[PDB]
A paper describes a structure:
Here, a methodology has been developed whereby per-atom density changes could be quantified with increasing dose over a wide (1.3–25.0 MGy) range and at higher resolution (1.98 Å) than the previous systematic specific damage study on a protein–DNA complex. Over a large dose range, the RNA was found to be far less susceptible to radiation-induced chemical changes than the protein. The 11-fold symmetry within each TRAP ring permitted statistically significant analysis of the Glu and Asp damage patterns, with RNA binding unexpectedly being observed to protect these otherwise highly sensitive residues within the 11 RNA-binding pockets distributed around the outside of the protein molecule. Additionally, the method enabled a quantification of the reduction in radiation-induced Lys and Phe disordering upon RNA binding directly from the electron density. RNA interacting with TRAP was shown to offer significant protection against radiation-induced structural changes.
Residue numbers in the entry:
A (entry chain G), B (entry chain H), C (entry chain I), E (entry chain K), H (entry chain B), I (entry chain E): 7 to 74
D (entry chain J): 7 to 73
F (entry chain A), J (entry chain C): 6 to 74
G (entry chain F), K (entry chain D): 7 to 75
The structure:
């Protein structure tokens, strides 16, 4: 099952899980401060992930960067 | 399952999930502001995804860009 | 399961799902306006897809372009 | 399951599906006009696909052209 | 299942399916006229395929040509 | 889903011979190809080895090999 | 199942496993000192991993480096 | 399931199938004359194959030659 | 199932297996003298492995080196 | 569908020794090869380790290696 | 299932299997003299392998060398 790597490039970046299922709402928001790295799978509970704030992101499709 | 990465290049980009099944309709519209990134799977509920607004998109098939 | 990416290059492009099974007919036609992207799986209900109108298409086999 | 991409290069192209099973006959013919693209899987009901008319075809084994 | 692409380079090409099982005989011949393409799988009923007449053939192991 | 071999006859009377799967090994079928005909043949529940006699151009997943009559 | 490699680049690095399921919280924090390497899988109990502190990290998607506060 | 290609480079090349199971002995020898090719699988009955005589051999690990 | 290779670059390298499950603690420590190699899998009982001491390490993601 | 090793004897009397799978480990068979013969041998229900003694050229999925007598 | 190749570069190399499961102990030590090759799988009974003595080692991650005593 795949995962995504998120490195925060400033304080207060939010990595947000969206619920798997008929319903789509947030469920959890993990706060990363500058320099922290989160490596997060898709799961039974999470089928979409949003990143808000400035971060360096790696997936199986390559690098992408979110901007705050 | 496969997933798509979508980076909003302007405010109010919509990532819309179409229902899996005999019937096809929108079940969910996720609004991304400029610079946000959504990493979204195909799932039991979502078998097609439509992007409206300017965004940079990655899929297993490479890059493509939606335009406003 | 495989998917196809379709970017509409003009207004009114139609992405048409054909039914899986003994019977073959159109069960849905999704209209895309210019610059919209649709990423669409093969599914239990859809075993062939037809694109009509000017579009840029990616699949596992590479890029192809439909014309209006 | 694998699929074929067909792009019609002229009007009137036929993409014809052949029945899986002990017997072989055509169960559907989809007409493509010039510039339309069909992406079609092999399925429970279709184990062979015939293309008639001028089209650009892609499969996992690369490009081929019908005339 | 694997499949073979056969493009007929002259009229009257025959693509012949041989029965799966302890018995081997031809169960079907699909006749192709010049420039027709047939994309044919191996199946519960067809464990060998013979081509007669001039054709350009593609398989997973590359290109081969048959000559009449 | 099994592997397959492509055989192109380079002369008349080429034989593609199927050997039986199981405790018993014997020839169960011999397919005659004449010059320029092609046979694409799988390994199967009944065929666990394939013998080619005569001049033929053969492709497997391991590459090209040629049999000589 | 996938795993991540983490090499601590200073003392006191924490590799934090987050619980799998509807609930998200830290269930374990593994402390690494300078020079030590942890190779950790995703598991039934850990579906996200956070790294705090300076570390050199490899995953299937390539190298990334965490930086400490 | 894997297979070995054997091309006889002289008469009387012997391709020898060894029994799968707790016991090991040969259960079949298939002789090849010069220029014949044998493509043989590993099977429920054959878990090791010995080639005697001069032969050109392909396996998934490359080419090897037996000397007779 | 994945494995790591550990080559000890000095005496007393410590390869530490952490218990798989809701609880985390070490369940085994295998010490290596200089020049010894351990090739160890992830298993039902081990889901994280820590290396202490100077070692040359190979995994599917490349080479890494622990320092004592 | 297991892996297999290719052993080509470079001298007479090479031994390809199968070791028993399971809790116990012992030689269950030594196949003797003479110079120039090739054995292609799988891992199986009964054989989980293979020892080669004598001079031989060996191929496995990780490359070529040579045993010496 | 994966395997490792070990070629002894001196006499008396040991290839040691560690038990799979909750208990970890050596259950077998295979002695190789110089020039002999052992190709050994991970198994229901062995989930880690230690090599002691000078040996040339191939795994799916490439070449490694153990250095003797
Ligand atoms: N308990 C959460 C942990 C998690 C994994 N991926 C995430 C991405 C975003 C937020 C939380 C998560 C889950 O299993 O789904
Ligand atoms: N709850 C939705 C979440 C989702 C995943 N991918 C999406 C794409 C678009 C909109 C919503 C989604 C689902 O499980 O299907
Ligand atoms: N409800 C449709 C959605 C869909 C997927 N791919 C498509 C292609 C064309 C039209 C509709 C679709 C289905 O699950 O099949
Ligand atoms: N109902 C048909 C649709 C179809 C798929 N691929 C085709 C190729 C040709 C004709 C029809 C089709 C099926 O599932 O088999
Ligand atoms: N009804 C046949 C159709 C077919 C598939 N592949 C073929 C190759 C040759 C001739 C016929 C076929 C079958 O399912 O087997
Ligand atoms: N009836 C035979 C047909 C066959 C497949 N591959 C072959 C190779 C050689 C001879 C016959 C065959 C079978 O299913 O096994
Ligand atoms: N007992 C934990 C061990 C572990 C694996 N990966 C981790 C990452 C971080 C923290 C602990 C872990 C588990 O099986 O999940
Ligand atoms: N009946 C034998 C045929 C065979 C396959 N591969 C071989 C290699 C050598 C000798 C015989 C064979 C089997 O199924 O096992
Ligand atoms: N009867 C043995 C044959 C065998 C396979 N590979 C071997 C390696 C060495 C010795 C014998 C063998 C087995 O099935 O296991
Ligand atoms: N009987 C042992 C044989 C073995 C396989 N690989 C090993 C590695 C080291 C020592 C013994 C072995 C087992 O099946 O596990
Ligand atoms: N009995 C342990 C052996 C082991 C495998 N990999 C390890 C890594 C570290 C320590 C012990 C091990 C197990 O099967 O899990």
């Amino acid at each position: 099952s795949d995962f995504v790597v998120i490195k925060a490039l400033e304080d207060g970046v939010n990595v947000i899980g969206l619920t798997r299922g008929a319903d789509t709402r947030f469920h959890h928001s993990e706060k990363l401060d500058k320099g922290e790295v989160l490596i997060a799978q898709f799961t039974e509970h999470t089928s979409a992930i949003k990143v808000r704030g400035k971060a360096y992101i790696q997936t199986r499709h390559g690098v992408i960067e979110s901007e705050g």
